[PDB]
């Protein structure tokens, strides 16, 4: 078991989201326990997990910068950005849906970190 991989999925994975609007962000951020305090920015990756795991290998990833990995394929993603001035709930989010490659860090073949900077 990798608790950081489990955490990665909790913070950054949502298989089949449907409508990826502000209300989507506001709900999932609560559901995933990211609202006390409100996380400033958080991106979810959609689709299957095996494509994400594959970023950790040559199959769907390249080494990137100091110790990160960058995906070969593009992913459907949704970035939830905090607005409204307060660090504390209720947390209001603006959703930005995207489609691009992603940057992760891996440990033992599993993603354990999403680089949020590319979504800022």
Is residue 91 within 8 Å of 35, Cβ to Cβ? yes
**Domain span holding position 65:** 1-120
Report, as residue numbers or ranges, the catalytic residues: 12, 113
Is residue 45 within 8 Å of 73, Cβ to Cβ? no
Identify the experimental approach: X-ray
Based on its alpha-carbon atoms, the radius of gyration of the chain, rounded to whole angstroms, reads 14
Residues contributing to the annotated binding site for tRNA: 20-21, 80, 102
The Cα–Cα gap between 41 and 82 comes to 6
Query: Who's near 116: CB < 8 A, 6+ residues apart?
Result: 41, 42, 43
- Give the C-alpha distances (Å, rounded to integers) separating 81 from 7, 37, 91, 102: 19, 13, 10, 17
Resolution in A: 1.9
Total domains present in the chain: 1
CATH code of the domain in which 80 resides: 3.10.130.10
Residues contributing to the annotated binding site: 20-21, 80, 102
């Amino acid at each position: 078991d990798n608790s950081r991989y489990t955490h990665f999925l909790t913070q950054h994975y949502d298989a089949k989201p449907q409508g990826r609007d502000d209300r989507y962000c506001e709900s999932i951020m609560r559901r995933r326990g990211l609202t006390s305090p409100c996380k400033d920015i958080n991106t979810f990756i959609h689709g299957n997990k095996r494509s994400i795991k594959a970023i950790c290998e040559n199959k769907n990833g390249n080494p990137h910068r100091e110790n990160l990995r960058i995906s070969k394929s593009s992913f459907q993603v949704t970035t939830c950005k905090l607005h409204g001035g307060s660090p504390w709930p209720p947390c209001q989010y603006r959703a930005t849906a995207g489609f691009r490659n992603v940057v992760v860090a891996c440990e033992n073949g599993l993603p354990v970190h999403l680089d949020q900077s590319i979504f800022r």
